[PDB]
Amino acid sequence: PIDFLKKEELKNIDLSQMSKKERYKIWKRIPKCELHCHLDLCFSADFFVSCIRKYNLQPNLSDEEVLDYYLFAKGGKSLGEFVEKAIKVADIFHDYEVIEDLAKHAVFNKYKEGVVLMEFRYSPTFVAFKYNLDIELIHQAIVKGIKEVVELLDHKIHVALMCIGTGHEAANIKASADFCLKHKADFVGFDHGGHEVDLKEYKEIFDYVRESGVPLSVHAGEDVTLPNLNTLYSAIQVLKVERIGHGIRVAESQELIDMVKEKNILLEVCPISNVLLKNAKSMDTHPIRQLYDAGVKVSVNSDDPGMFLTNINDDYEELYTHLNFTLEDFMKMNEWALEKSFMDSNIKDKIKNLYFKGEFEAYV
Ligand SMILES: CSC[C@H]1O[C@@H](n2cnc3c2N=CNC[C@H]3O)[C@H](O)[C@@H]1O
Ligand SMILES: [Zn+2]
């Protein structure tokens, strides 16, 4: 059982005297609450390469060329290109067995990384398109795979699901919204991913989801190539989201920074994703430092461990190494993520008690 760091204990840890390996041991011991991780793009290199071989998908490529062709581990051009490679990766959604395996593995690896609260998200209609799978059996496979691992683990990690709509056709977004609500019992939130579009047009679809009791967190303010910040205004003012996926472009506008703070919105920051997709110049210039210092609530997230060949503790390493975040900062961020989690209040209460009970400093 991971020896999770406690709030009152952090002042005794000297990270400056540690090797990279020893720091990773400390990142593992942070009780992490992760809000933004696409389960359908969450795997290791090994898992991915097996899948490709299992279905004889690339007989002309070495393992290394398969990783290069399909994934984004060295970074790319833009979110646009990222969306194009995701489409390619859908080569592996061959059947429901591989899907269930994917879900077991993803949860197991989060557990070993020291995540205690995990909101996974996935896009059913996406996962279905390549082989025209049935979204109902896709969901059953994922829920089954998750339940089995959580049970095996004695509920040591708490997992919830969010449903993502993708694309810019009302028909597909509506079909996802209906699926999400049909499966309200499993889904705790509703998202939009894919190319970044202004969601204001789909107001009535999102209203209906939000008003049926499923809160919203949509991808917005990620893609630096958009000619304005309209997508952020829409998510906040029209969709009335509780959280924003990425939202890093909020840093470009004092008006938006004030809006997010005043509305108590949390930004689900994905540091490595933004650098690899060219939405931040380098980790040294990542807006999370500005936003955190401006008093915006932000949490740390991996986004797509499979596309980047990373895990959540790599994001912590980069933030510590490039931007000088501290263990205190990390604990504060995870407690914000805990408070803004869409999971049941009973579960959040348990987690608070288990991991976030003390205070950083003694009463004086
Ligand atoms: C199997 S991924 C299904 C999808 O969800 C989308 N997505 C996955 N990871 C992210 C996605 N969308 C936008 N921003 C990049 C990243 O956060 C992806 O482009 C595809 O549209
Ligand atoms: Zn994402």
Side-chain angles (χ1 to χ4, degrees), residues 36 38 121 219 246 303-304:
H36 197 126
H38 297 256
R121 58 182 68 185
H219 289 64
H246 307 282
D303 207 5
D304 310 274

Side-chain angles (χ1 to χ4, degrees), residues 7-37:
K7 291 158 106 174
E8 342 68 48
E9 300 180 331
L10 303 178
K11 57 191 181 29
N12 316 317
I13 288 154
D14 187 354
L15 288 163
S16 71
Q17 291 306 301
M18 288 188 184
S19 61
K20 180 173 197 145
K21 288 187 175 285
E22 299 173 318
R23 297 193 296 272
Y24 272 86
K25 289 187 81 170
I26 295 296
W27 310 145
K28 182 163 171 247
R29 302 176 50 207
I30 300 172
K32 287 161 292 288
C33 302
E34 180 177 18
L35 297 182
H36 197 126
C37 185

